[PDB]
Design a protein around this ligand. Structure first.
Ligand code: GTP
Ligand code: GTP
Ligand code: JEL
Ligand code: CA
Ligand code: MG
Ligand code: MG
Lengths: 421, 59, 440
């Protein structure tokens, strides 16, 4: 088949990863023992994508869950569907990373990384035809940030022709007071720009503002932010996990969404937070974007949109045409037909019809500037920099990550200002 | 008739040759593209060796 | 003899092949098990339908066809479908990983892994032939396999079969059903590479077929299944001259003599009528004059373009069913004095006509009305270059910024191949512009 190998690392990567598996194990009708208890052969036609079929007919996540402190993984195996995971696929350390990137990338992560790669290999070589890998992790912490991007470099060495996607969670002072986070995020980006094909920028700055202001949840738990991410994760993988008019693997979807290799950072969205017109209206609205960026401050290079639930597909076609016509200035004119739409007739749990948004917009540079602002404020003070040179790192490695990320922003601006003539 | 044979043969011939250098040039380019990618990842390995190594030269 | 081997490449080629061969079986009375009760010569024959069907000693009539895709899920449905018994398993060829809408993967990276096997299987069919006439190649312009692998195959067939004729049925991309933003790139790459190796190519604009299904069969949002069943009727009309015999029958090569004035000018415009739902065909017979007029109304063309703003170099009318020359001549005379038909000054203006008696057939539960007569017009018009212009412009918009080009370079291609391909298309567009200029 075409199987994906999933990886979750760090506090954040494991928390959002667990919820990810609860939603999609739900949809495919598989209980926390692993037995199919659905009603549709449709729930199994692409079951290979995220599951191994085991003896006694039990579907097992092709998931590798990783950390540098054992606590967070104890919760997964005790949390729902914890008994469904492959027990040997638990790869934890004991000496944590302490929200330090060098610990995750060079010193502590470097020591645990090879035993993770062994688990990757065991899962990979059993696949008929592996599409590639998907990682959940944060760029603010230490394990998901530095070891997650170290593990990406190592996988791209051993699987250099496989696709590497990530749901990377960007840090915001509105959720985690931890102060060295802009240092971590900038060093991770300097990695993801080179070694990933498709990175969804999940922004806590955003996720906070949506629970606060739309769902009206003051004091929002991480379980509230993740409830949104899990709906985004389920949406963008809906085409892969079910049979529709579109039959596209990871590479084919990256091909039609990534016009330039460095510019593979997407701002996703979800709606409702209905009628096809307002569903479409909501999802292009900036208030439904999981990245703290205004699309009407830049231009779309490409856009994917995924509707779910029974609905007139003729009306969806008319309304996507409508939005493009009314918002033509915000789609670059030198990429014809750069907005593609998919419809899955299976709706999510709870919602009769929803819409998931994937946007490759030059306005994502707004994100990369917020981080770069908080980074350069700290960097020229050298605040908490001894935590990094302690692990052996060099001032120069910081400066490159800064310049390589200032380079990325200007490149987004170059194509935002380009015209057909 | 001899001219027609010669012309069917040259077309078959040049098509065989044009294709063969294309497949070779494509073989060369794709290899020189993956190798360059690997070598950036191996310079990556040394660098990380120098970071673990410098830290030991710190006590 | 005069066998024709059909090669279906990629999703679009394969699924259109499914539609065509099911349609052929119904036209010839062949069952899904391959048995044909009306064929009294068991194990073989020289009948007209044997140009497309071989016979096993056990009475099975087997398509002279190969199905190829770099991915198994589409051809798997052929292996488990209603007509799975019709094909020897060696006629169905699949890799594991597809071209990912990348011409380079279809032509070089993934395609080179399976091309030798494909040619081996094609040879096995050719050795069965006593008089092989040529090949019919079905593929999309947009897919990585339909574009990249097809052109690789066409180059190889020229080497292995010389100047044995090769005809194409090519699916011209339309945004209403495209899966990909890079299809303009793949379209120009394959067209450039295949141009020297194709003797005649029938382009099918998915937008033209999409609109016809919406407007004439009143399907709100047509599917590939709706499109392919209509495409089959056009393909069937074009190949009917090879699969049936009749006194009035004119054999596709004869039409080709007229349709191709220079080797590169080999893209005929097809127009088909009547396309009509069962609701509307009830108590309304479409006459010869009525279906003939429909051929000059541009909404019925396979490719969106305006022949009324271009010039004709050839006009052929392929009738099937209840039709006699008396009716045809009257209808043509009517048209010739009322329509915008301008010929280039270096061509005769007569319309070449062929008639098959065997009436049009319809698939069970299709949306087409079963009709007593149908017509397919094949015209060589300068207007078809409008299709090249639209694609060439989409190519230009993206290539100026090299959008997506890194995907092709990463699989071994160079920017030089892109510019060389686009320069060929510019010359091709200029060739169409030259043929229409008057003489001195
Ligand atoms: N949305 C969301 N973000 C989380 C969650 N848990 C942690 N984070 C984010 O993660 C960032 C900090 O990184 P960590 O959570 O510590 O991840 P880590 O790299 O494993 O850090 P260690 O605990 O030292 O291993 C903060 O900015 C948080 O916003 C969660 O459950 N949901
Ligand atoms: N008419 C028609 N067109 C189709 C059909 N299937 C796909 N297409 C068209 O083909 C184009 C994409 O190329 P595909 O044929 O799907 O791709 P492929 O040939 O399988 O090659 P890959 O990219 O490797 O998958 C799109 O523009 C579609 O409009 C079909 O069944 N009928
Ligand atoms: C698999 C698929 C995708 C979706 N990518 C995509 C879709 C479409 C597209 C281009 N790309 N164009 C389209 C047109 C119509 C419809 C859909 C698309 C993303 C992904 O990344 C992750 C990474 C970490 C995760 C995760 C997913 O789930 C849990 O953790 C993995
Ligand atoms: Ca016989
Ligand atoms: Mg932790
Ligand atoms: Mg395919």
């Amino acid at each position: 088949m075409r199987e994906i190998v999933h990886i979750q690392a760090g506090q954040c990567g494991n928390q959002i990863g667990a919820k990810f598996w609860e939603v999609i194990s739900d949809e495919h009708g598989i209980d926390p023992t692993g037995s199919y208890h659905g009603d549709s052969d449709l729930q199994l036609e692409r079951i290979n994508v995220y599951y191994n079929e085991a003896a006694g007919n039990k579907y097992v996540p092709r998931a590798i869950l990783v950390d540098l402190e054992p606590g967070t993984m104890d919760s997964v195996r005790s949390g729902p569907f914890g008994q469904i995971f492959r027990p040997d696929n638990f790869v934890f350390g004991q000496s944590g990373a302490g929200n330090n990137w060098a610990k995750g990338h060079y010193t502590e992560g470097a020591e645990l990384v090879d035993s993770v790669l062994d688990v990757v290999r065991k899962e990979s070589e059993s696949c008929d035809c592996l599409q590639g890998f998907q990682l959940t992790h944060s760029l603010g912490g230490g394990t998901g940030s530095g070891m997650g991007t170290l593990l990406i470099s190592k996988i791209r060495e051993e699987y250099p022709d496989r696709i590497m996607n990530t749901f990377s969670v960007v840090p915001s002072p509105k959720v985690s007071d931890t102060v060295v986070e802009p240092y971590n995020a900038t060093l991770s980006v300097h990695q993801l720009v080179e070694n990933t094909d498709e990175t969804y920028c999940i922004d806590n700055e955003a996720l906070y503002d949506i629970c606060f202001r739309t769902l009206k949840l003051t004091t929002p738990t991480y379980g509230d932010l993740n409830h949104l991410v899990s709906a985004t994760m389920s949406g963008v993988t809906t085409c892969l996990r079910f049979p529709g008019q579109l039959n596209a693997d990871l590479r084919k979807l990256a091909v039609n969404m990534v016009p330039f290799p460095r510019l593979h950072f997407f701002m996703p969205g979800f709606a409702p937070l209905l009628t096809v017109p307002e569903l479409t209206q909501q999802m292009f609205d900036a208030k439904n974007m999981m990245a703290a960026c205004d699309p009407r401050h830049g231009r779309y290079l490409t856009v994917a949109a995924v509707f779910r639930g029974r609905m007139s597909m003729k009306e969806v076609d008319e309304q996507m045409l409508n939005v493009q016509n009314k918002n033509s200035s915000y789609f670059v004119e030198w990429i014809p037909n750069n907005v593609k739409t998919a419809v899955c007739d299976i709706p999510p749990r709870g919602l009769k019809m929803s819409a998931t948004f994937i946007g490759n917009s030059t306005a994502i540079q707004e994100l990369f500037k917020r981080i770069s602002e908080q980074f350069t404020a700290m960097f020229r003070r050298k605040a908490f920099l001894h935590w990094y040179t302690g692990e052996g790192m060099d001032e120069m490695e910081f400066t490159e990550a800064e310049s390589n990320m200032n380079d990325l922003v200007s490149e987004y601006q170059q194509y935002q200002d380009a015209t057909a003539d | 008739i001899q001219k027609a044979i010669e012309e069917n043969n040259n077309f078959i011939k040049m098509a065989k040759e044009k294709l063969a250098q294309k497949m070779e040039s494509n073989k060369e380019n794709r290899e020189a593209h993956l190798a360059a990618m690997l070598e950036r990842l191996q310079e990556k390995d040394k660098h990380a060796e120098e970071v673990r190594k410098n830290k030991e030269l710190k006590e | 003899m005069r066998e024709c081997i059909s090669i279906h490449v990629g999703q679009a080629g394969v699924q259109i092949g499914n539609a065509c061969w099911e349609l052929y079986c119904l036209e010839h009375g062949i069952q899904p098990d391959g048995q044909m009760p009306s064929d009294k010569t068991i194990g073989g024959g020289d009948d007209s339908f044997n140009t497309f069907f071989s016979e096993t000693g056990a009475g099975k009539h087997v398509p002279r066809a190969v199905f190829v895709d770099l991915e198994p899920t589409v051809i798997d449905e052929v292996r488990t479908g209603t007509y799975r018994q019709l094909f020897h398993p060696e006629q169905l060829i699949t890799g594991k990983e597809d071209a990912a809408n990348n011409y380079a993967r279809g032509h070089y990276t993934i395609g080179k892994e399976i091309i030798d096997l494909v040619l081996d299987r094609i040879r096995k069919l050719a050795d069965q032939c006593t008089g092989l006439q040529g090949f019919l190649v079905f593929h999309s312009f947009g897919g990585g396999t339909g574009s990249g692998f097809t052109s690789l195959l066409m180059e190889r067939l020229s080497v292995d079969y010389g100047k044995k004729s090769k005809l194409e049925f090519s699916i011209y991309p339309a945004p209403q059903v495209s899966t990909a933003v890079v299809e303009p790139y793949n379209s120009i790459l394959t067209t450039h590479t295949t141009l020297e190796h194709s003797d005649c190519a029938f382009m099918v604009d998915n937008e033209a077929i999409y609109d016809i299904c919406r407007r004439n069969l009143d399907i709100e949002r047509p599917t590939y299944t709706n499109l392919n069943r209509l495409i089959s009727q056009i393909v069937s009309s074009i190949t009917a001259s090879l699969r049936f015999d009749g006194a009035l029958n004119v054999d596709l090569t004869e039409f080709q003599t007229n349709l191709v004035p220079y080797p590169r000018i080999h893209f005929p415009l097809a127009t088909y009528a009547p396309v009509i739902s069962a609701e509307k065909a009830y108590h309304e017979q479409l006459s010869v004059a009525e279906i003939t007029n429909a051929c000059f109304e541009p909404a019925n063309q396979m490719v969106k373009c305006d022949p009324r703003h271009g010039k004709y170099m050839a006009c052929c009318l392929l009738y099937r069913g209840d039709v006699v020359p008396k009716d045809v001549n009257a209808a043509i005379a009517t048209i010739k004095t009322k329509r915008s038909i301008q010929f280039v000054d270096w061509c005769p203006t007569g319309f070449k006509v062929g008639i098959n008696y065997q009436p049009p057939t319809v698939v069970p539960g299709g949306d087409l009305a079963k009709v007593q007569r149908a017509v397919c017009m094949l015209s060589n018009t300068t207007a078809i270059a409008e299709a090249w212009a639209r694609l060439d412009h989409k190519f230009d918009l993206m290539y100026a910024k090299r959008a997506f080009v890194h995907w092709y370079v990463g699989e071994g291609m160079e920017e030089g191949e892109f510019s060389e391909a686009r320069e060929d298309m510019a010359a091709l567009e200029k060739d169409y512009e030259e043929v229409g200029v008057d003489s001195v």
